[PDB]
Ligand binder design. Structure first.
Ligand SMILES: [K+]
Ligand SMILES: [K+]
Ligand SMILES: [K+]
Ligand SMILES: [K+]
Ligand SMILES: [K+]
Lengths: 81, 92
């Protein structure tokens, strides 16, 4: 129950997240690395503020690194209220 | 974090903000906040990760991360929304 945010338009990942939520998945994690990290935050904010206002909480946010080169990563856990 | 102890990460090279963060930490500031908006959000994460992987491994804790949105006015007068991140870090 993970949406990996990559290079595609942000609405791709917004719709992927809503699809899971509408399937009865109440907790999903949005993940990204490198420059896509800002698009992962966009994805969550669009889902939280524009689609499901007052029904999505941000449960936790983790940042880290991975070797490839070091690249940064983010993981954002969201939950239905 | 008092207002002097926020590093607002923007358009400059990432080592500029790494240097700002290390300077505050070296001066004894216990708590700092790394903030950014829009595409600089990924550079803000980079800043924290470079600090704690390349310079001060095992000395920096991430106290809390908050994300949100801001309303930005462009030069032509339109308003749109930009994402935000705030990363509180502290030593020990
Ligand atoms: K990207
Ligand atoms: K130091
Ligand atoms: K930038
Ligand atoms: K503005
Ligand atoms: K403009």
């Amino acid at each position: 129950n993970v949406v990996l945010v990559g290079k595609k338009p942000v609405m791709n990942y917004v719709l992927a997240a809503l699809t899971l939520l509408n399937q009865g998945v109440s907790e999903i994690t949005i993940k990204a690395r490198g420059r896509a990290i800002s698009k992962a935050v966009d994805t969550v904010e669009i889902v939280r503020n524009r689609f499901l206002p007052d029904k999505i909480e941000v449960k936790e946010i983790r940042i880290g690194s991975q070797v490839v080169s070091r690249v940064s990563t983010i993981e954002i856990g969201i939950r239905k209220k």
